[PDB]
């Protein structure tokens, strides 16, 4: 799946959101939702919905 990088220290506002800190790499991205995609952190392997606007897609 697509991948993305974090641009802001995101602290998952709703619980089942993902959480990352700037320059954080995200992978295995999916289009679970138009606005919140799902991830997998390449650095730690964490998955969760994230507000695509808090991150930039590397694809």
């Amino acid at each position: 799946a697509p991948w993305a990088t974090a641009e802001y220290d995101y602290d998952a506002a709703e619980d089942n959101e993902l959480t990352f800190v700037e320059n954080d790499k995200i992978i295995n991205i999916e289009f679970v939702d138009d606005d919140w995609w799902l991830g997998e952190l390449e650095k730690d392997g964490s998955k969760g919905l994230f507000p695509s606007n808090y991150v930039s897609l590397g694809n």
Binding site: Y8, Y10, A12, E14, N16, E17, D35, Y54
Partner: peptide
């Protein structure tokens, strides 16, 4: 806390715990 991060926009209500 952070000072410079977008506001996590709405969330499709079908993607919440439980």
């Amino acid at each position: 806390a952070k000072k410079t991060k977008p506001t996590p926009p709405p969330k499709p209500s079908h993607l919440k715990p439980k």
